[PDB]
Amino acid sequence: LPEDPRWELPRDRLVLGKPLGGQVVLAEAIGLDKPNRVTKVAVKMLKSDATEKDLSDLISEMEMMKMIGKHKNIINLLGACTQDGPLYVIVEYASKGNLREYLQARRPPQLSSKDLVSCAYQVARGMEYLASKKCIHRDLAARNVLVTEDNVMKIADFIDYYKKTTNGRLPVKWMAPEALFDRIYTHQSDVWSFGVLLWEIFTLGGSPYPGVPVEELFKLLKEGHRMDKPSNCTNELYMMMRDCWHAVPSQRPTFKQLVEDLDRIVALTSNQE
Numbered sequence: 001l002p003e004d005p006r007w008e009l010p011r012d013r014l015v016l017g018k019p020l021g022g023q024v025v026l027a028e029a030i031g032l033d034k035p036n037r038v039t040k041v042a043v044k045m046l047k048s049d050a051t052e053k054d055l056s057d058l059i060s061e062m063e064m065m066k067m068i069g070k071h072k073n074i075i076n077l078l079g080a081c082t083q084d085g086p087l088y089v090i091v092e093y094a095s096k097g098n099l100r101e102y103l104q105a106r107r108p109p110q111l112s113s114k115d116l117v118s119c120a121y122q123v124a125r126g127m128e129y130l131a132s133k134k135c136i137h138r139d140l141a142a143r144n145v146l147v148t149e150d151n152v153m154k155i156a157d158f159i160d161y162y163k164k165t166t167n168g169r170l171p172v173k174w175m176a177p178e179a180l181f182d183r184i185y186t187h188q189s190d191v192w193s194f195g196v197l198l199w200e201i202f203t204l205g206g207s208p209y210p211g212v213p214v215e216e217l218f219k220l221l222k223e224g225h226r227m228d229k230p231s232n233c234t235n236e237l238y239m240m241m242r243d244c245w246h247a248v249p250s251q252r253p254t255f256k257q258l259v260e261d262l263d264r265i266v267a268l269t270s271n272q273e
């Protein structure tokens with residue numbers, strides 16, 4: 001592994017902490033920039049039984065993050081430890097966890113309608129930036145959105161159709177029909193995923209199609225079935241979800257259009273309830 005001086009951080013500057021979920025740990029970086037300050041960071045490293053391909057996957061992930069560049073609404077690369085020891089990929093720390101967890105914790109036994117629209121605007125803004133960088137996410141969902149201490153949404157990324165997430169959810173439930181059935185991945189298939197993410201925001205971390213297995217989901221998709229309008233969701237925001245879920249990919253709005261519409265909606269959405 002060659003030392004990249006734009007990103008390299010000496011090992012003696014990284015104080016490894018508690019695991020966050022290869023494997024991700026919380027850590028403290030001494031002098032990432034003054035040199036006398038600690039910055040809380042998240043570090044990705046390989047698990048004890050990692051393969052040669054697991055290592056090559058972490059390298060390529062790091063190399064891609066280097067090319068994407070900085071944005072307020074994406075989890076940004078901060079550094080790396082590549083010399084004389086295991087590969088550490090260092091990113092910004094998001095203290096309020098993933099957006100699914102963030103939302104569920106703030107359900108009534110708090111977030112206004114304007115905060116929820118702002119959440120959707122921020123994710124759309126991060127997606128617009130990734131698209132401008134010629135990137136396709138493939139796994140956009142609230143679990144892949146991180147929330148910082150200051151409530152900033154940051155897009156992140158942590159195949160068998162039957163494999164479930166830790167929470168017991170099926171990732172096929174976020175996939176556009178053409179991505180699922182024809183293996184065609186585009187910004188248009190990501191916009192379909194963003195529609196499922198809007199539904200997740202407005203149900204405050206609700207699970208899409210609960211109890212629906214893969215074979216039954218395929219049937220719902222073939223029939224042109226669409227998820228119901230969440231409670232406390234405007235007609236305009238439900239039409240946005242439905243447009244994101246257009247059967248014809250060219251007819252779906254783009255992230256650029258979604259940012260413009262969400263920007264306008266945020267400004268007209270009240271923070272009084």
Ligand SMILES: Cc1ccc(C(=O)Nc2ccc(CN3CCN(C)CC3)c(C(F)(F)F)c2)cc1C#Cc1cnc2cccnn12
Nearest residue numbers: 020042043044074075091092093094136137138155156157
């Ligand atoms: C350590 C770490 C390493 C890497 C990444 C990461 O997100 N990598 C990433 C890889 C690829 C892509 C884009 N591609 C998608 C695939 N696609 C096919 C090509 C384009 C992106 C993206 F943001 F751009 F989307 C990100 C996140 C973390 C974290 C963390 C962290 C911070 N706070 C907390 C709090 C709790 C838990 N974790 N945590």
